[PDB]
Design a protein that fits this description.
The protein is mainly alpha-helical and 272 residues long. Helices cover 64% and strands 0% of the residues. GO terms for molecular function: GTPase activator activity; small GTPase binding; TSC1-TSC2 complex binding.
Amino acid sequence: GVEEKKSLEILLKDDRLDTEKLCTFSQRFPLPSMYRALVWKVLLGILPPHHESHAKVMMYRKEQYLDVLHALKVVRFVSDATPQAEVYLRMYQLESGKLPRSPSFPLEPDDEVFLAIAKAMEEMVEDSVDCYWITRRFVNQLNTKYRDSLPQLPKAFEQYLNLEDGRLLTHLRMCSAAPKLPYDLWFKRCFAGCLPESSLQRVWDKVVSGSCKILVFVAVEILLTFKIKVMALNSAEKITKFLENIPQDSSDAIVSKAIDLWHKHCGTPVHS
């Protein structure tokens, strides 16, 4: 990481940031935590590549943020005590025109995905304005850039698990567990709520930098990590429930191994 940060810092020395090389860097290496929000904002198009214009665009974004937060408070949809991730969901709904009848109206499925991702982002990005916009764009990528890929990830998960450990997949299949696995947690919420955020953010570097396939390998690696546990469980529900509440102490090792598995099977070009 010490060399990598220096090479990133060279990339960040340009007046006009080279977004193609920020992408290839992010696909191959973890982003240094002090430059993550920056790189994520440029890659998601929240900031332009000329860093002389960053403070200004962020001013427009902060201003729009405070306009919407204020309009929510005037209508009484949120209060001082509303959790921050919920504020972001309501801000998103109000901006998108989908604000429900009242704060007490049950959440819809896409609302729950947004909310799970918001809660995870709040631990990754310090500044609220950054957090809100990064969350908005991150979720919009899922719903646009990746709309037709996400539904293919379960099939990919089976394929690559079958390659890494057919015995484990054989076990899942003989219990009819495959169809009941928590695909929505893995491939709509992108592990938000599942992996701790110090580790998750390394997965999301890759998602932000254009890969949704990294999610398959994180899923495959979870299963490999907990192979002995899973093989002992003899029913579809026990398996599913375990996978929705995994132990968290190996999550750094899971993410690192997942990244290597992905590079292996998908041929991620080296950074230059």
